[PDB]
Amino acid sequence: MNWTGLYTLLSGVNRHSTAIGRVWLSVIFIFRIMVLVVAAESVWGDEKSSFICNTLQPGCNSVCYDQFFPISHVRLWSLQLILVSTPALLVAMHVAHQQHIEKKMISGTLWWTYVISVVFRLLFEAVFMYVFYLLYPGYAMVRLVKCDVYPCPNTVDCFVSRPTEKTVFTVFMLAASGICIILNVAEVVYLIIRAC
Amino acid sequence: MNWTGLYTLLSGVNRHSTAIGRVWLSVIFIFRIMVLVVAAESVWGDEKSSFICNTLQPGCNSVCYDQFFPISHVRLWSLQLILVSTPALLVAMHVAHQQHIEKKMISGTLWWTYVISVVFRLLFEAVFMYVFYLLYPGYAMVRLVKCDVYPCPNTVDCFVSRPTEKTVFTVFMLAASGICIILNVAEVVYLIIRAC
Ligand SMILES: CC(C)CCC[C@@H](C)[C@H]1CC[C@H]2[C@@H]3CC=C4C[C@@H](O)CC[C@]4(C)[C@H]3CC[C@]12C
Numbered sequence: 001m002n003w004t005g006l007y008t009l010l011s012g013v014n015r016h017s018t019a020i021g022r023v024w025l026s027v028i029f030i031f032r033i034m035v036l037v038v039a040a041e042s043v044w045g046d047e048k049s050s051f052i053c054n055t056l057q058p059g060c061n062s063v064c065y066d067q068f069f070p071i072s073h074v075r076l077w078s079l080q081l082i083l084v085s086t087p088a089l090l091v092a093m094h095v096a097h098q099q100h101i102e103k104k105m106i107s108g109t110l111w112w113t114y115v116i117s118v119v120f121r122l123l124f125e126a127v128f129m130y131v132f133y134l135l136y137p138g139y140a141m142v143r144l145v146k147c148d149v150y151p152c153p154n155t156v157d158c159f160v161s162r163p164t165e166k167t168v169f170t171v172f173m174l175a176a177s178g179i180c181i182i183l184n185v186a187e188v189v190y191l192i193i194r195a196c
Numbered sequence: 197m198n199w200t201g202l203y204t205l206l207s208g209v210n211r212h213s214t215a216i217g218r219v220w221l222s223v224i225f226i227f228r229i230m231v232l233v234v235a236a237e238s239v240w241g242d243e244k245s246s247f248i249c250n251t252l253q254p255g256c257n258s259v260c261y262d263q264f265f266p267i268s269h270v271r272l273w274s275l276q277l278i279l280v281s282t283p284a285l286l287v288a289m290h291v292a293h294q295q296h297i298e299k300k301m302i303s304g305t306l307w308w309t310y311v312i313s314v315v316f317r318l319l320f321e322a323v324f325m326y327v328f329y330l331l332y333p334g335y336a337m338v339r340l341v342k343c344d345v346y347p348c349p350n351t352v353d354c355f356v357s358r359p360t361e362k363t364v365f366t367v368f369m370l371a372a373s374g375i376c377i378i379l380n381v382a383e384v385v386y387l388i389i390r391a392c
């Protein structure tokens with residue numbers, strides 16, 4: 001777990017990444033993973049089991065939970081991290097492949113593919129930010145929700161588990177994601193400026 | 197239980213009552229009592245115990261039953277019979293009192309008090325008919341009712357016991373009451389005509 005080994009691993013052995021991309025982006029990425037790990041099973045572990053509705057209708061609990069939580073926040077963030085990390089993984093594999101072929105026997109190609117990688121990383125961050133806004137308007141969760149989907153008769157009151165703690169972690173993850181967007185834009189601008 | 201004894205009892209030993217008042221009104225009165233007796237404990241016995249609402253809210257069953265049944269049909273008819281029978285009871289007691297005092301020792305007074313008795317009997321019938329319409333619009337009861345009174349959350353579905361059988365007896369009692377109103381009006385008109 002040598003510091004130089006961890007730095008080499010996270011940097012992806014890329015010769016075009018700048019200081020922000022090799023230090024700040026990696027740290028924020030680690031921060032999001034650690035927050036997600038400590039908050040996934042602990043806070044969102046009983047999201048559905050503890051979800052109850054004030055009714056005697058069989059199946060109203062499950063249908064109301066599905067109505068109000070089409071996809072859990074933890075899974076949404078997990079997908080966001082995987083999708084955001086994919087272009088970095090592709091660049092790392094491409095660099096390793098180039099090292100392999102040159103050992104068996106370019107700089108502009110590496111520069112261009114890195115820039116495209118950062119652009120796609122920024123694009124994925126923006127898309128997931130918009131999707132999160134679309135599914136869950138606002139940032140705070142409420143204790144009581146009004147559910148009227150079939151088979152629930154009329155409108156029933158359903159209660160969410162730990163809405164305040166989930167709100168706190170939602171703010172943390174959203175703030176970290178916003179910082180990643182800002183750093184990615186700065187990285188793109190810095191690369192373009194240095195290219196001239 | 198001699199027929200002449202029952203006839204003397206029901207007639208009230210009144211010398212001004214006509215054939216309709218001494219035969220038809222008494223028979224319909226007996227009919228209402230018999231219908232009420234067979235339908236009071238059997239049909240309306242479990243009106244509240246069998247009344248259930250699709251909710252987990254404690255106390256919603258009792259509050260919803262009170263909201264939709266301010267007073268049961270059986271008790272409403274029981275009060276109607278007592279109130280309708282009161283002027284007949286007063287006349288019978290007054291006749292007995294006059295017999296008592298004359299034995300110890302008028303016809304116009306008996307005629308007038310009988311006419312007033314029939315008028316009040318008609319008035320009570322009309323008032324209870326209007327009250328029944330006011331509390332229970334229409335004649336048929338429904339299986340499912342929508343209740344939203346506190347503490348029930350939002351609107352809950354509550355289910356009535358034997359709404360069809362109660363509807364049948366409601367029609368019977370209402371029809372008998374309407375016949376009593378018609379006979380009372382006929383009695384008043386006949387007495388006035390014979391008075392001239
Ligand atoms: C600058 C930032 C974005 C760098 C992010 C680096 C991420 C994308 C890279 C760094 C090291 C990578 C890990 C290296 C090895 C493995 C083992 C494999 O069997 C599963 C994937 C896994 C666990 C990789 C997941 C992606 C990973 C964590």
Ligand SMILES: CC(C)CCC[C@@H](C)[C@H]1CC[C@H]2[C@@H]3CC=C4C[C@@H](O)CC[C@]4(C)[C@H]3CC[C@]12C
Pocket residue numbers: 205206207217218221222225281282284285
């Ligand atoms: C022509 C129609 C309206 C006549 C109706 C007669 C009714 C009003 C009269 C006839 C005989 C009466 C009953 C005679 C005796 C008693 C015993 C008493 O301890 C309670 C009331 C009770 C049970 C009376 C109730 C009223 C009664 C039923």
